[PDB]
Scaffold this active site. Structure first.
Site, PDB file in Angstrom:
ATOM      1  N   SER A   1     -20.084   8.479  -5.733  1.00 32.07           N
ATOM      2  CA  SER A   1     -20.632   9.852  -6.198  1.00 32.07           C
ATOM      3  C   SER A   1     -20.632   9.738  -7.959  1.00 32.07           C
ATOM      4  O   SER A   1     -21.501  10.213  -8.703  1.00 32.07           O
ATOM      5  CB  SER A   1     -19.301  11.079  -6.318  1.00 32.07           C
ATOM      6  OG  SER A   1     -19.050  11.413  -5.076  1.00 32.07           O
TER       7      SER A   1
ATOM      8  N   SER B   1       0.621  -1.118   0.183  1.00 35.92           N
ATOM      9  CA  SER B   1       0.396  -0.151   0.438  1.00 35.92           C
ATOM     10  C   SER B   1       0.843   1.088  -0.064  1.00 35.92           C
ATOM     11  O   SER B   1       0.346   2.246  -0.757  1.00 35.92           O
ATOM     12  CB  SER B   1      -1.155   0.529   0.952  1.00 35.92           C
ATOM     13  OG  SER B   1      -1.690  -1.145   0.818  1.00 35.92           O
TER      14      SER B   1
END
Ligand code: HEA
Ligand code: HEA
Ligand SMILES: CCCCC/C=C\C/C=C/C/C=C\C/C=C\CCCC(=O)O[C@H](COC(=O)CCCCCCCCCCCCCCCCC)COP(=O)(O)OCCN
Ligand SMILES: CCCCCC/C=C\CCCCCCCCCC(=O)O[C@H](COC(=O)CCCCCCCCCCCCCCC)COP(=O)(O)OC[C@@H](O)CO
Ligand SMILES: CCCCCC/C=C\CCCCCCCCCC(=O)O[C@H](COC(=O)CCCCCCCCCCCCCCC)COP(=O)(O)OC[C@@H](O)CO
Ligand SMILES: [Cu+2]
Ligand SMILES: [Cu+2]
Ligand SMILES: [Cu+2]
Ligand SMILES: [Mg+2]
Ligand code: NA
Ligand SMILES: [Zn+2]
Lengths: 55, 258, 137, 102, 70, 43, 512, 47, 72, 91, 227, 46, 78
Positions: free
Chosen positions: G255, G157
């Site tokens: 969104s 990550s």
């Protein structure tokens, strides 16, 4: 020492279709085969160890 | 392509690198619990051979093939800054562990810092020398940078050599200090914080010195132009980071906690 | 043909970028040719092909309500039903008997004791037992 | 801007002598995005533009979109069709209902 | 036919049902405060008003629930 | 949004084998292990 | 050619595909683990056999769902696939390093599996708190293998975060400012900047446990002068940002989905949502101690953490009330993706609200370490994060594969899952309020009803997971290609067709 | 479509199966639901 | 520029390092070893080290590092 | 001395970008093109190596929404949102 | 204790737990408003054929978005913090009892005047005499005086455990090397149960807490007889 | 050049629907099965 | 001057963590014992601390500390 970068530029730009990691020559192929043999072999060995440890 | 970005050739290094990580962690487990260093040894060899072959290829792609256009170089700058930021946060965790243990010494330690039985190294003795050594290497590496930009090969090499010698000097001094320290890593939350924090720092000094050595050889081989030498810039940013972390360690671990 | 303007039937984009039929055949090419003079002289049948040359679904057709919701709801409930089969299988082959504290001669006594120690006397449990009439309020 | 100014800018827009098909589509497609069933004066100007463009089919989609935009209110389209009955009859414009596209 | 309202029919709808929405949600209010919250406050005040802790303990002791009081 | 007609139409017996393959091949390893749990317990 | 393409990849699409595959597999493992949890709690008594096997199952369930399913799918999968396409970039900044972020996951997963097989596994909770995770309470390699898994997942990550933040700042068209990039791209950047700054602290912390377990250090050992609570601070300093890392890319996809299926060209209040995602990311780094309200901290420290935690609600509310405003006036397309997004909006709100209940240190005294917490996080994770992943998956599957799913089957899948997760987690609120502790293999008799109902809901979810695998087969089996995508003018990722060529934007796209 | 021809038969048949097999599971297989004794259990003497 | 930094490498930085090097080397001497007291927090052994006999630290110095039982 | 310059040693794409900037050109799209008035007579001219290029139109400055569409070789096209005109030209 | 099919909190046994019940009910009213308003608004947005797809400006919509939600987060914080501080108020205890968590049982110490220490183990299901709650009963209960402020000190001799009694609103972590304090005060006599609330190994599920509240007099006799 | 288009940008082949069911049933079902085989191993040991 | 019930509230240690309170009064009983004996003063008067450490300190802590003071390894200053 003398500046030989131009020679190296010629060698690495030579249109032979080879990927950058093997374009240096036979040694790359020897060094890549050694890194690959140890990595896969060592992984198999770790799998074996996980067997011995777990049981 | 009519964009300036680098489309990298399919490479085996990401895989060999990931596998070497498996071998090193598997290896540490085998060492800590099944008394064997075999796996660990193999992991460390394949990490170094993947890393030589990964960074070697980056040099080939840039110095030899010309893939580092200004856009590519600006990305590498952001990459290095971000990497250094994450390294700073890593150290922050160690400082947090020191300022937690120190500013509230538990009864087992006698309620005071340093813990009873602990005789710290004088901050002004060898630790001050280490400090002047790293600060001095910060100055010499800046001289090296300016020499390179001014197109001065001899002085760039000279300054860089001095920087490296200083990093090695610090490493040797620290190694010696570790050996002569009356306290060990097993001596409570004092030895723990001391050795793990200065130990990871020493590791970064070794990594940083190695990075500088790589630059020294690439310089010897005329890889750097007076205007394009990101490898050197990254090595220098990393070196300053190592320098700043040391300043925080000396001020907190030694002067404040002795 | 991803790069090219396409036709769409949407309430909020009434006039698409192209026509639904673009390769007009000879009969269709002539309908487009009759469109040139007063529209009063276009019969009701040419006036619908003109429309059908330009668009694919009328507003009514594009905004039709379907019977899909019945298939969705009944399939959802066949598969929730199928889940009960898995639960039946589990109670039968996996689960052993539950603790003896659930048997009636135990859950009675336990209730008497909970009432005796006045468990939740303000609202929760004992508050629901009439200590005077000796029964559940 | 004011209703009357808004109404005139589109009447003006559709009343341009040399409308290109593209502007007719752009005007109608843009207009239906606004919370207003367009005034009869705007739609007739648009209907007249589809004639100068020899586009029957669009004149009928323009009368379908006006009904669509009114939604629950069922009184907006019958008034609009009445106000534009003179333009529809003259241009030769058959409503979505007569054609059977409703 | 008379000219009906043709502008802001979405906004008009939202405003109207916005007034409604507070009334449905505060509809829980003057009410949940009455079926759960005031019933708890009243049930605790009622319970403790004339509560006798010693009498309560005596009852529990006589029932034998205690380990330290028989 | 629209989609083309299928290059091969799926029959009822084609979906019956596919859907019962998705269910049975998870419940058989889960079933044989969860049923025999008392047998592993005995040593 | 197969090995060069799939093992030596330097292509963002192929790498994103690998991530999606890995995450799907991980999800099966995590689902199995959750079934074992609910099987043990399905009726009073003991099933697996000992509590240590249960506490090993619970721990692995969390690690798998978080590190191997959610993060790889959202960030590595959707991130790699969509980010370059949405900014018109030819690939990621460091295409080779990107491949290493992926390849570190299988080894990481192997270490996790190794830990739960050697010795008695690591039954410590995903938080791994010393002293239980020490060399006396849990002696042996298990906890050490778990720590090594988290390091490889964290290196993956951090080397992914560096790549995303560099790509997003440096590789947009010259005329495109940051405030002209899609919200999903902004969600991935503020997730990457939170990964970069949190996972090094976690790494520091777990390295210190490692040394406490193997090198005789005493950072957390009270006998040597250390403090078990120090570990908690280091862990949670990463832990809270981690939960926002799990939901931010979800907010970004939501969104896009809500805007798309509302037939809108843009989301409502673009700049308020960009500001809300920058606030939800800065506030997320000053509230960690709300996971430590019962450890014995000063009252003023507790008053501060209560207050700071409830300010996270204001930013997350300028997103909820923007998604609703995006639906407002839309020509709604009731596609399966839209359904997942609508469920997300409502269910995430519920989970967020119970989070605001927990923020109160006073109340948290009673709710801490009870099933009320488990209810809270499963609503935001198992309903929030997961619904965003499902919505994004059905919406973009045609783009990634070139094939379209059967919409009716997808709507059936949504219906089953919706019932399953609600039946599983809603009753857990009751169990929490009434006092059922977390990490308990068995419970007092009074808790039986709600635990039974919860376990039967978990089986409904299993049915939905099995159906989803069938649905993906059916799509690949039938081979229905994608003709026309609507709204390409405001969804650049679809503009190169389905699936896009291996090499997109060789010729970049924008006037200044 | 498929839905117009058979949709009504899916809402009806599917709902009846779900109510059935679930009713069977909750009442015929011995699941212990452990309802509140308030109203149902007659207390008995523990000692 | 380079000139200012060359001077600072040779005329301020290095001179600083020179004063300090002599300071540590002259002002050193092996330290005197304190009496061994068995404080419980110190010389912690919760698990043997993965090297040697498992009881001696990595950089163990017999002169100054006592084992849990006292200087060898 | 002794340190090479970019002029003497830059190669590949790096060298091309370098030499082109000296001549004032931008073959590798490093700069953002400045807009014309965007009318039919003076269309923004989009240079392309093929028969299509994607155009992103920021209709009015401060738009957060970019309008995307393909420009194809032939006549000019207009942004579906603001109507400004663009035409594709050979690279 | 919890009873079958319980939905909310166990009945309050202390004044502070009563305080929390009223605070929870107020917080649930705010969850009940914003969670049902959001669901209503979703349905409102989705149930109309009327459209407005052009740019909607968040000019003044933003001001209510930041200024109004801040005001409710104040209406929840004020009573929450009032209670928080109330729990920290000086208590003047009459008795101090310590409890040490262990790997799978609790030990108690009442060393104000003479030692009265003992272990407290869960009564196994098999040896549960009829009527005894499964997983909740212990051999030795924590006898304490009712209607008295008591100071409880919690720690552990091994891993971390957590001492909890829901009916009294208590939960204090048992951390090795640390002495955590909390104050207990029962308004009534009786038996009050709790369970270990921090994962501590293979038997976390099995190490309950049982308080026995009796009048002072009985507490004293018990004291004596237990030494 | 790497083949492009649908069914050709993936590491598994989608040409036969029945081999794909077999590959996908094993990929997904092997992941679901693995947590249960860890519980058998853990119970079996002691 | 006693008739002690339990250790009073100390402003010095007003939070929940009371580890130091226990430690302090264990140390101070011993520090006052040492100081009093020097001034031939009663060691009967350091008992206020004894009552307060016995009340607050876990028996195992006191027991460990006593074993260590005897072994010579008490960490604190007494
Ligand atoms: C993302 C995180 C995540 C998710 C999704 C879930 C999902 C589920 N969890 Fe949870 N769980 C945790 C994270 C998660 N959990 C954590 C962090 C803990 C705490 C651990 C600890 O205490 O230490 C925990 C603890 C926990 C407990 C409490 C254990 C205890 O305290 O004793 C329980 C109990 O019922 C439980 C049940 C379940 C169930 C039934 C599901 C079901 O809803 C699962 C249903 C299946 C899915 C939702 C997965 C579907 C997704 C895919 C398969 C990908 C598909 C592929 C593509 C689209 C490409 N979980
Ligand atoms: C996706 C992951 C995710 C997300 C987004 C959140 C979001 C939040 N969480 Fe949570 N949480 C977890 C994952 C998550 N959490 C996990 C995994 C644990 C347990 C870990 C462990 O211990 O094992 C946990 C536990 C946890 C705790 C610790 C409880 C304890 O054990 O002691 C707390 C403390 O208060 C907390 C609070 C919050 C708050 C205030 C938010 C806020 O973001 C929520 C804000 C959102 C809303 C409030 C709803 C929408 C807003 C509006 C509609 C506006 C109006 C609202 C108001 C005015 C209130 N959660
Ligand atoms: C002088 C400059 C050189 C600095 C480094 C010194 C040499 C050895 C250590 C290497 C440095 C790298 C990391 C190790 C850090 C932590 C502990 C080691 C610190 C250290 O090096 O200090 C020594 C500890 O030795 C020991 O145990 C050594 C045992 C080594 C085993 C380390 C195990 C691996 C730990 C790391 C785990 C991997 C994860 C790392 C983070 C990655 C995040 C993703 C001190 O020895 P001592 O005699 O006990 O004291 C002096 C007494 N006369
Ligand atoms: C042997 C001792 C054992 C200990 C192990 C440690 C050893 C290994 C790490 C040492 C670091 C060596 C790094 C060598 C990098 C060489 C490649 C390089 O520097 O590549 C450069 C690009 O920068 C780039 O990628 C810059 C990228 C640099 C990345 C390196 C960052 C540091 C690595 C950290 C590794 C572990 C981190 C620690 C975590 C705990 C090359 O481009 P330019 O310079 O612009 O050239 C172009 C001009 O010449 C044109 O004319
Ligand atoms: C034993 C316990 C745990 C062990 C875990 C070990 C994990 C992995 C070990 C193996 C990794 C070593 C192999 C070398 C990696 C170099 C990556 C690198 O150098 O990446 C560079 C980019 O990142 C940049 O510069 C910016 C950043 C340079 C990154 C250097 C990588 C170091 C890896 C360790 C990271 C630790 C994280 C630190 C925080 C605590 C180059 O990017 P590429 O995509 O390649 O090319 C792009 C081309 O345009 C270049 O011409
Ligand atoms: Cu948090
Ligand atoms: Cu415990
Ligand atoms: Cu426990
Ligand atoms: Mg806890
Ligand atoms: Na159980
Ligand atoms: Zn435009």
């Amino acid at each position: 020492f003398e500046n030989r970068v131009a020679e190296k530029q010629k060698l690495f730009q030579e249109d032979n279709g080879l990927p950058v990691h093997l374009k240096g020559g036979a040694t790359d192929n020897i060094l890549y085969r050694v890194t690959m043999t140890l990595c896969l072999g060592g992984t198999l060995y770790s799998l074996y160890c996980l067997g011995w440890a777990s049981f | 392509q009519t964009h300036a970005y680098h489309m990298v050739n399919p490479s085996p290094w990401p895989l060999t690198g990931a596998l070497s990580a498996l071998l090193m962690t598997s290896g540490l487990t085998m060492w800590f619990h099944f008394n064997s260093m075999t796996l660990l040894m193999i992991g460390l060899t394949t990490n170094m051979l993947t890393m030589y072959q990964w960074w070697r290829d980056v040099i080939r792609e840039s110095t030899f093939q010309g893939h580092h256009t200004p856009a590519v170089q600006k990305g590498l700058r952001y990459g290095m800054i971000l990497f250094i930021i994450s390294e700073v946060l890593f150290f922050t965790g160690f400082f947090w562990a020191f300022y937690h243990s120190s500013l509230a010494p538990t009864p087992e330690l006698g309620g005071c810092w340093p813990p009873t039985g602990i005789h710290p190294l004088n901050p002004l003795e060898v630790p001050l020398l280490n400090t002047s050594v790293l600060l001095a290497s910060g100055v010499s590496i800046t001289w090296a940078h300016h020499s390179l930009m001014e197109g001065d090969r001899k002085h760039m090499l000279q300054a860089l050599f001095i920087t490296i010698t200083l990093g090695v000097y610090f490493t040797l001094l620290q190694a010696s200090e570790y050996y002569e320290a009356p306290f060990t890593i097993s001596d409570g939350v004092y030895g723990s914080t001391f050795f793990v924090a200065t130990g990871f720092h020493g590791l970064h000094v070794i990594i940083g010195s190695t990075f500088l050595i790589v630059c020294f050889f690439r310089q010897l081989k005329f890889h750097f132009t007076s205007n394009h030498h990101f490898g050197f810039e990254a090595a220098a940013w990393y070196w300053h980071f190592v320098d700043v972390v040391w300043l925080f360690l000396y001020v907190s671990i030694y002067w404040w906690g002795s | 043909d991803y790069a090219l303007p396409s036709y769409v039937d949407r309430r909020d984009y009434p006039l698409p970028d192209v026509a639904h039929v673009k390769n007009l055949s000879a009969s269709q090419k002539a309908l487009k040719e009759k469109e040139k003079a007063s529209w009063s002289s276009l019969s009701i049948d040419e006036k619908v092909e003109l429309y059908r040359l330009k668009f694919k679904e009328s507003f009514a057709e594009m905004n039709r309500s379907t019977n899909e919701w019945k298939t969705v709801v009944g399939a959802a409930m066949f598969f929730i039903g199928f889940t009960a089969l898995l639960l039946i299988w589990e109670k039968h082959y996996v689960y052993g008997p539950i603790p003896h504290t659930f048997e009636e001669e135990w859950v009675a006594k336990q209730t008497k004791r909970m009432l005796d120690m006045k468990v939740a006397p303000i609202q929760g449990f004992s508050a629901k037992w009439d200590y005077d009439k000796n029964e559940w309020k | 801007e004011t209703d009357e100014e808004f109404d005139a800018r589109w009447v003006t827009y559709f009343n341009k002598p040399d409308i290109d098909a593209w502007e007719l589509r752009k005007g109608m497609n843009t207009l239906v995005g606004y919370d207003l069933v367009p005034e009869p004066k705007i739609i007739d100007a648009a209907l007249r533009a589809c004639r100068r463009l020899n586009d029957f089919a669009s004149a009928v989609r323009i009368l379908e979109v006006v009904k669509d935009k009114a939604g629950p209110h069922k009184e907006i389209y019958p008034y609009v069709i009445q106000e534009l009955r003179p333009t529809l009859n003259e241009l030769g414009i058959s409503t979505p209902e007569e054609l059977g596209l409703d | 036919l008379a000219k009906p309202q043709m502008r802001g029919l979405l906004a008009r709808r939202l405003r109207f049902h916005i007034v409604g929405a507070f009334m449905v949600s505060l509809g829980f209010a003057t009410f949940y405060k009455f079926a759960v919250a005031e019933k708890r406050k009243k049930a605790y005040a009622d319970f403790y008003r004339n509560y006798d802790s010693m009498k309560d303990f005596e009852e529990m002791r006589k029932a034998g629930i205690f380990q330290s009081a028989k | 949004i629209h989609s083309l007609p299928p290059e091969g139409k799926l029959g009822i017996m084609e979906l019956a084998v596919g859907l019962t393959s998705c269910f049975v091949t998870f419940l058989l390893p889960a079933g044989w292990i969860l049923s025999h749990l008392e047998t592993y317990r005995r040593p | 050619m197969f090995i060069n393409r799939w093992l030596f990849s330097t292509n963002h699409k192929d790498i994103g595909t690998l991530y999606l595959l890995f995450g799907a597999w991980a999800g099966m493992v995590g689902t199995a683990l959750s079934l074992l949890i609910r099987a043990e709690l399905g009726q009073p008594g003991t099933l697996l056999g000992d509590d240590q096997i249960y506490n090993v199952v619970v721990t692995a369930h969390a690690f798998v769902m978080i590190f191997f399913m959610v993060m790889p799918i959202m960030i590595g999968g959707f991130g790699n696939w969509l980010v370059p396409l949405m900014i018109g970039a030819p690939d990621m900044a460091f295409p080779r390093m990107n491949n290493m972020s992926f390849w570190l996951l299988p080894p990481s997963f192997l270490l996790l599996l190794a830990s739960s097989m050697v010795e008695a596994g690591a039954g410590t909770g995903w938080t791994v708190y010393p002293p239980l995770a020490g060399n006396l309470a849990h002696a042996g390699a298990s906890v050490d293998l778990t720590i090594f898994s988290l390091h490889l997942a964290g290196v993956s990550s951090i080397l992914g975060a560096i790549n995303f933040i560099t790509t997003i700042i440096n590789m947009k068209p010259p005329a495109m400012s940051q405030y002209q990039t899609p919200l999903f791209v902004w969600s991935v950047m503020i997730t990457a900047v939170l990964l970069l700054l949190s996972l090094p602290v976690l790494a520091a912390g777990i390295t210190m446990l490692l040394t406490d377990r193997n090198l005789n250090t005493t950072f957390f050992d009270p006998a040597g002068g250390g403090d078990p609570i120090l570990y908690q601070h280091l862990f949670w300093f990463f832990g809270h940002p981690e939960v926002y890392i799990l939901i931010l890319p979800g907010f970004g996809m939501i969104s896009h989905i809500v805007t798309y299926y509302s037939g809108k060209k843009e989301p409502f209040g673009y700049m308020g949502m960009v500001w809300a995602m920058m606030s939800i990311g800065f506030l997320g780094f000053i509230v960690w101690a709300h996971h430590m309200f019962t450890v014995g901290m000063d009252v003023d420290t507790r008053a501060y953490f209560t207050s700071a935690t409830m300010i996270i609600a204001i930013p997350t509310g300028v997103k909820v009330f923007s998604w609703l405003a995006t639906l407002h006036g839309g020509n709604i397309k009731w596609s399966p993706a839209m359904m997942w997004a609508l469920g997300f909006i409502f269910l995430f709100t519920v989970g967020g609200l119970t989070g605001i209940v927990l923020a109160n240190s006073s109340l948290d005294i009673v709710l801490h370490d009870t099933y009320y917490v488990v209810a809270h996080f499963h609503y935001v994770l198992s309903m929030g994060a997961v619904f965003a992943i499902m919505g994004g998956f059905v919406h973009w599957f045609p783009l990634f594969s070139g094939y379209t799913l059967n919409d009716t089957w997808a709507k059936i899948h949504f219906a089953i899952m919706f019932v399953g997760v609600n039946m599983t987690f809603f009753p857990q609120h009751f169990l929490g309020l009434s006092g059922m502790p977390r990490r308990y293999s068995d419970y007092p008799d009074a808790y039986t009803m709600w635990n039974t109902i919860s376990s039967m809901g978990s089986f409904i979810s299993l049915t939905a997971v099995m159906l989803m695998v069938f649905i993906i087969w059916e799509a690949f089996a039938s081979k229905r290609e994608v003709l026309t995508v609507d709204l390409t003018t405001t969804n650049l990722e679809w503009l190169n067709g389905c699936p896009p060529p291996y090499h997109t934007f060789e010729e970049p796209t924008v006037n200044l | 479509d498929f839905h117009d021809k058979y949709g009504n038969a899916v809402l009806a048949s599917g709902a009846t199966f779900c109510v059935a097999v679930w009713v069977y599971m909750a009442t015929q297989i011995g699941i212990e639901w452990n309802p509140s004794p308030v109203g149902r259990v007659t207390p008995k003497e523990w000692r | 520029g380079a000139r200012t930094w060359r001077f600072l490498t040779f005329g301020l930085a290095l001179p600083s390092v020179a004063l300090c090097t002599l300071n540590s080397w002259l002002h050193s001497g092996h330290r005197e070893r304190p009496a061994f007291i068995p404080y419980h927090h110190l010389r912690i052994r919760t698990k043997p080290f993965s090297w040697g006999d498992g009881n001696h630290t990595f950089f163990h110095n017999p002169r100054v590092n006592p084992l849990p039982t006292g200087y060898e | 001395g002794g340190v090479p310059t970019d002029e003497e040693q830059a190669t590949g794409l790096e060298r091309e970008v370098m030499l082109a900037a000296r001549k004032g050109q931008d073959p590798y799209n490093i700069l953002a093109p400045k807009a014309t008035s965007g009318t039919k007579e003076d269309p923004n001219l989009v240079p392309s190596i093929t028969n299509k290029r994607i155009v992103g139109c920021i209709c009015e400055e401060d738009n957060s929404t970019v309008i995307w569409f393909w420009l194809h070789k032939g006549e000019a096209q207009r942004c579906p949102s603001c109507g400004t005109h663009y035409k594709l030209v050979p690279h | 204790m919890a009873y079958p099919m319980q939905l909310g909190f166990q009945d309050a046994t202390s004044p502070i737990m009563e305080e929390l019940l009223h605070f929870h009910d107020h917080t649930l009213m705010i969850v009940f408003l914003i969670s049902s308003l959001v669901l209503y608004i979703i349905s409102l947005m989705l149930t109309t054929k009327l459209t407005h797809t052009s740019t909607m400006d968040a000019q003044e919509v933003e001001t209510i978005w930041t200024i109004l939600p801040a005001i409710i987060l104040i209406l929840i914080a004020l009573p929450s913090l009032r209670i928080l501080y109330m729990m920290d108020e000086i208590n003047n205890p009459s008795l101090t009892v310590k409890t040490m968590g262990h790997q799978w049982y609790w030990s108690y110490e009442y060393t104000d005047y003479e030692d009265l220490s003992f272990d407290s183990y869960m009564i196994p299901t098999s040896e549960l005499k009829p009527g005894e709650l499964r997983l909740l009963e212990v051999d030795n209960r924590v006898v304490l005086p009712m209607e008295m402020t008591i100071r409880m000190l919690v720690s552990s001799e091994d891993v971390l455990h957590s001492w909890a009694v829901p009916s009294l609103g208590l939960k204090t972590d048992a951390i090795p090397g640390r002495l955590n304090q909390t104050t207990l005060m029962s308004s009534r006599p009786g038996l009050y149960y709790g369970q270990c609330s921090e994962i501590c190994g293979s038997n976390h599920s099995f190490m309950p807490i049982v308080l026995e509240l009796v009048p002072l007099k009985y507490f004293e006799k018990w004291s004596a007889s237990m030494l | 050049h790497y083949e492009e288009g649908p069914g050709k940008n993936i590491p598994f082949s989608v040409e036969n629907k029945w081999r794909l069911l077999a590959m996908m049933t094993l990929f997904f079902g092997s992941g679901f099965a693995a947590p249960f085989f860890i519980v058998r191993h853990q119970l079996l040991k002691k | 001057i006693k008739n002690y019930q339990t250790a009073p509230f100390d402003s010095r240690f007003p939070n929940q963590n009371q580890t130091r309170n226990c430690w302090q009064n264990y140390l101070d009983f011993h520090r006052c014992e040492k100081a009093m004996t020097a001034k031939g003063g009663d060691v009967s008067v350091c008992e206020w601390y004894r009552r307060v450490y016995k009340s607050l300190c876990p028996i195992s802590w006191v027991s460990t500390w006593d074993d260590r003071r005897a072994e010579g390894t008490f960490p604190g200053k007494i």
